[PDB]
């Protein structure tokens, strides 16, 4: 009966692939032939945030488009006032091996996690005046790779044990566990209505989940290596991926297939971070060749290079109003671009 | 021109600057050792005299050591191995009595060859080009009791020396250091662990002293 189940799975894979082929009446390149190009995007470094003394692994913007948190391997979580380059807080972490950091949309909490398999939640607005631990989320067996806040009580984490988990901060227990990936999950990004979230793993597959019922809605394939980065479109109807095979790919949640491939011949280095603009016209990607390309998301042409880092661009963030782009990197520097 | 609140915020940021600088100055004089090895290869038998990542902190000859254990990480290794790029040295533990045993996960596979494959991946990784490796070859008493009963030729078919302790031990020692590609860039220090106290930590201290001297030679421009 095991061979019959494998045959049924293969038949369903063929059904999925020719259903995807059936709706592929035209590509994204044919529709956007007559639109105007964005021209040369020239962005200068407006601020430089110095203070970290190790490789910066992740940053997250605030929803006020001014505060930002950043994590690095020296055991310090630092909140920056990006307008004046002032350091509001400096959180000393118990474990210096962090790979992700989150900033709550209300602003009262930050999160971090990494090789200690623990998501630590820090309370910012404290009556005592210092930032303290509020809840340590233990449950994963693999390293935490990415985590985003839903609100002040719900946080979803992607881990290195091929699982995504939805947590309740007050109780400290996980409510929904998302299982389906075979490779280690590296990044997740959440929809603007916070009802769905995509998830990229090391098995070159992107899976669209549902936060409520906790089942995988769709699975997206088209990559050949470890997907390291993922980000929704601003409307929530599309998302982009970044992997080690030096390409970025745009998917559609409704057509359930590939839309556009972002790659060039001289680029042979993987992508560590992706982000969109406010309108979604520009797709920005952080590569390993020390640079950051700006892609026309509708025409798949490079539009500009944010060349200003002396090491690998590990993280990338865009403000909610689209004013600025922050590029952290392994050379202990955060740079604000505009 | 700043406000009074803005000036006090800048003063708070400068105090945060000096605290970060003194914390970094305390962290800069810290020996970071990444411990590696295979399962049941004597990984945990050297931390007694010297989930997630387990960090061991200890002092020897007024020098503080950070020793990191990543043996509990069952995930894919290359996604997090670049986090240990700036370590001083890598401690590698290989069991001497593991030349004639089969992996439980995969049949017809020696753990000596699996540890050799792990050493080949670690030593010749692109993140660890300059980092020296302190190779520990442990459980020599069981190896001495086992080499008389079991020959070494079932592990290495090309072995032609006698079945004595010293010749076979030196043979497999050279069979570990011949894997290094960049012999010039990195050194491989080799110790056979003993049940007597403070020998292993003395070897680690001498090896990291040599590594620190070589790094000072690199920074001063002599090498």
């Amino acid at each position: 009966e095991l061979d019959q189940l494998r045959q049924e799975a293969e038949q369903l894979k063929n059904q999925i692939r020719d259903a995807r082929k059936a709706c592929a009446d035209a590509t994204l390149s044919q529709i956007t032939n007559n639109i105007d190009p964005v021209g040369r995007i020239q962005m200068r470094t407006r601020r430089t945030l110095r203070g970290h003394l190790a490789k910066i692994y992740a940053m997250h913007w605030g929803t006020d488009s001014r505060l930002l948190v950043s994590a690095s391997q020296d055991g310090k979580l630092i909140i920056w006032d990006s307008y004046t380059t002032n350091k509001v807080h400096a959180i000393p972490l118990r474990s210096s091996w962090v790979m992700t950091c989150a900033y709550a949309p209300s602003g009262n909490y930050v999160a971090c996690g990494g090789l200690d398999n623990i998501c630590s939640i820090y309370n910012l607005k404290t009556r005592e005046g210092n930032v303290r631990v509020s809840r340590e989320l233990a449950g994963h067996t693999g390293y935490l790779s990415c985590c985003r806040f839903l609100d002040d009580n719900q946080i979803v984490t992607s881990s290195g044990d091929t699982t995504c988990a939805l947590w309740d901060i007050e109780t400290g227990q996980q409510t929904t566990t998302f299982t389906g990936h075979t490779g280690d999950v590296m990044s997740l990004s959440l929809a603007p209505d916070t009802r769905l979230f995509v998830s990229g793993a090391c098995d070159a597959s992107a899976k669209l989940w549902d936060v409520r019922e906790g089942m995988c809605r769709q699975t997206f394939t088209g990559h050949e290596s470890d997907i390291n980065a993922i980000c929704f479109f601003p409307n929530g109807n599309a998302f982009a991926t970044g992997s080690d095979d030096a390409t970025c790919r745009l998917f559609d949640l409704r057509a359930d297939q590939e839309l556009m491939t972002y790659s060039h011949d001289n680029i042979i280095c993987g992508i560590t971070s992706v982000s969109f603009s406010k309108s979604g016209r520009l797709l920005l990607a952080g590569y390993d060749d020390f640079n950051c390309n700006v892609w026309d998301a509708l025409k798949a042409d490079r539009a500009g290079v944010l060349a200003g880092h002396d090491n690998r661009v590990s993280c990338l963030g865009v403000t909610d109003d689209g004013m600025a782009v922050a590029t952290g990197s392994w050379d202990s520097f955060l740079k604000i671009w505009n | 021109t700043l406000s009074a609140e803005d000036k006090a915020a800048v003063e708070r940021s400068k105090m945060i600057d000096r605290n970060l600088r003194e914390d970094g100055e305390k962290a800069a004089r810290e020996v970071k050792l990444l411990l590696l090895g295979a399962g049941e290869s004597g990984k945990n038998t050297i931390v007694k005299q010297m989930t997630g990542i387990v960090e061991t902190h200890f002092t020897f000859k007024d020098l503080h050591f950070k020793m990191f254990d990543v043996g509990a990480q069952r995930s894919e290794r290359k996604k997090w191995i670049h986090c240990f790029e700036g370590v001083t040295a890598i401690i590698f533990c290989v069991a001497l009595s593991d030349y004639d045993l089969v992996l439980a996960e995969d049949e017809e596979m020696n753990r000596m060859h699996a540890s050799m494959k792990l050493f080949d991946s670690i030593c010749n990784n692109k993140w660890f080009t300059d980092t020296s490796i302190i190779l520990f070859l442990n459980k020599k008493d069981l190896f001495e009791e086992k080499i008389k009963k079991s020959p070494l030729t079932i592990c290495y078919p090309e072995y032609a020396g006698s079945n004595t302790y010293e010749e076979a031990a030196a043979y497999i020692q050279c069979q570990f250091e011949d894997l290094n590609k960049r012999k010039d860039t990195k050194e491989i220090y080799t110790h056979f662990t003993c049940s007597t106290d403070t020998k292993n930590v003395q070897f680690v201290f001498d090896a990291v002293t040599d590594v620190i001297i070589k790094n000072n030679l690199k920074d001063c421009g002599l090498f």
Partner: single-chain antibody, 234 residues
């Protein structure tokens, strides 16, 4: 809980010396810049001295400059105020005030319990037009403050601070930076302004809300309070 206990005050001769001590508990004292605010038995609040976090920046009022000195002891969590050549104008009530400064912080959030003392030109002037308003509960009372110059800075912040002193205890912070409501204060209190003209809109006035209301400015040192608008029943 955050607690500031003050001691050392009492009866002194004119021209004498007396040392004030504000004991701190329940908060990280080393990261808070402390103040001293003086209140006469008949008059309102008056700022005296300020020491920054880490004792880096120290200011004084023009009345008490040179005579008073302010020091803090972060390991034992004590704020000091050594007084020399005391005169009859220093016969008043003293408060140590907690304050912190970063982006979005709430300075002057907590006030000390208070100790009393008995002795045997370019500044911004905060003018409150009314000194006493008879008001019933359940009504919407507006309290206004005026400024000599515009409190609106180029960064967009209007540094206006509202305080309420209930009869019997320390003043408490209600509104910080003109429009932001404080923590632990009800939502009824509302504040707004326009650079020079300010107002505080209290709606559905309760009974515990009576007391003396003060305005203050943080745009430039020295810190000048208001005259004091008092709310009473009927």
């Amino acid at each position: 809980d955050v607690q500031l206990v003050e001691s050392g005050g009492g009866l002194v001769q004119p021209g004498g010396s007396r040392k004030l001590s504000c004991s701190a508990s329940g908060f990280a004292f080393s990261s808070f810049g402390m103040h001293w605010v003086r209140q006469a038995p008949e008059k309102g609040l008056e700022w005296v001295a300020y020491i920054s976090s880490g004792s880096g920046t120290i200011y004084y009022a023009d009345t008490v400059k040179g005579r008073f000195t302010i020091s803090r002891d972060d390991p034992k969590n004590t704020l000091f105020l050594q007084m020399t050549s005391l005169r009859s104008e220093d016969t008043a009530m003293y408060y140590c005030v907690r304050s912190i400064y970063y982006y979005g912080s709430s300075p002057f959030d907590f006030w000390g319990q208070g100790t009393t003392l008995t002795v045997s030109g370019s500044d911004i002037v905060m003018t409150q037009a009314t000194s006493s308003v008879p008001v019933t509960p359940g009504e919407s009372v507006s309290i206004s403050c005026r400024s000599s110059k515009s409190l609106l800075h180029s960064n967009g912040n209007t540094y206006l601070y509202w305080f309420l002193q209930r009869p019997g205890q320390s003043p408490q912070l209600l509104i910080y930076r003109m429009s932001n409501l404080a923590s632990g204060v009800p939502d009824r209190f509302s504040g707004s302004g326009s650079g020079t003209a300010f107002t505080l809109t209290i709606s559905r006035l309760e009974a515990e809300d009576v007391g003396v209301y003060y305005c203050m400015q943080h745009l430039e040192y020295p810190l000048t309070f208001g005259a004091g608008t008092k709310l009473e029943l009927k």
